[PDB]
Amino acid sequence: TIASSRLRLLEYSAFMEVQRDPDTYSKHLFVHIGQPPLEAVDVRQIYDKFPEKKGGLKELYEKGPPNAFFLVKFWADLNSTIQEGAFYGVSSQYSSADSMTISVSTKVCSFGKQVVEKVETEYARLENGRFVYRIHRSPMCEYMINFIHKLKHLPEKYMMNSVLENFTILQVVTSRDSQETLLVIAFVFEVSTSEHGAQHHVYKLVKD
Numbered sequence: 001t002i003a004s005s006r007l008r009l010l011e012y013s014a015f016m017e018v019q020r021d022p023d024t025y026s027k028h029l030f031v032h033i034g035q036p037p038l039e040a041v042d043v044r045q046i047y048d049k050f051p052e053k054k055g056g057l058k059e060l061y062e063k064g065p066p067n068a069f070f071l072v073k074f075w076a077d078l079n080s081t082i083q084e085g086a087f088y089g090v091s092s093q094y095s096s097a098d099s100m101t102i103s104v105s106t107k108v109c110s111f112g113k114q115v116v117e118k119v120e121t122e123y124a125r126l127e128n129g130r131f132v133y134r135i136h137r138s139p140m141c142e143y144m145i146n147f148i149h150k151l152k153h154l155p156e157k158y159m160m161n162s163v164l165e166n167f168t169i170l171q172v173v174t175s176r177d178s179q180e181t182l183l184v185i186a187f188v189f190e191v192s193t194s195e196h197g198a199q200h201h202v203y204k205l206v207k208d
């Protein structure tokens with residue numbers, strides 16, 4: 001469970017979907033976090049992998065609160081399980097006890113430098129006593145689709161992991177009005193090698 005004192009990540013999944021005929025659709029999940037204590041990772045170990053200087057991970061952690069910082073290790077399923085005009089997208093859902101407008105910023109980094117940034121504003125929906133935020137079928141940018149295609153063309157999974165050693169995604173969720181940090185999730189990737197498919201391990205980012 002990825003949750004700070006103000007916001008909780010309920011679900012997250014990146015996928016590709018194909019239309020096999022007018023009434024048939026296939027969907028392949030690359031990564032997924034669906035709906036206990038976490039092991040810790042020192043945030044200083046990953047500083048070099050994210051953009052630093054103004055608005056960087058170090059400045060974000062220093063600004064606080066520390067309870068909002070998480071690291072997700074993903075083992076993405078890049079096996080061609082469906083035959084590919086496919087749609088590549090991301091779906092996620094968050095929740096809070098307070099009604100607020102959020103801003104979800106996703107920074108894609110390559111060698112610690114930001115190459116793509118997507119910003120989406122989400123409005124609170126009152127649902128079962130709590131406030132829910134849904135980003136449904138958010139399309140992937142061409143940079144990411146072309147990156148997945150290029151990894152899928154490497155003949156070995158250890159080659160894909162070598163490339164992915166320099167690829168990270170930083171997700172920062174802030175309160176739109178106050179600009180307060182609600183949730184920060186650093187994503188690191190490897191390619192899945194088990195018949196169980198895509199895997200994930202969540203950690204809490206700490207300092208000492």
Ligand SMILES: NC[C@@]1(c2ccccc2)Cc2cc(Cl)ccc2O1
Pocket residue numbers: 109110111147150151154163164166167168
């Ligand atoms: N141009 C070669 C490289 C690459 C190689 C094989 C498969 C996919 C991509 C190396 C690389 C690292 C990152 Cl982090 C992002 C993009 C990227 O492009």
Ligand SMILES: NC[C@@]1(c2ccccc2)Cc2cc(Cl)ccc2O1
Pocket residue numbers: 046049073074075161164165166167168188189190
């Ligand atoms: N290659 C190992 C690692 C990893 C292992 C298992 C699952 C996901 C990712 C650890 C790691 C840290 C960073 Cl900053 C960037 C990439 C990265 O890849």
Ligand SMILES: *C(=O)CCCCCCCCCCCCC
Pocket residue numbers: 014015030031076090106108118139140141144147148151164167169189
């Ligand atoms: C905007 O394009 C952000 C898209 C974030 C995609 C999440 C990546 C998870 C899909 C598997 C890729 C793993 C190796 C790149």
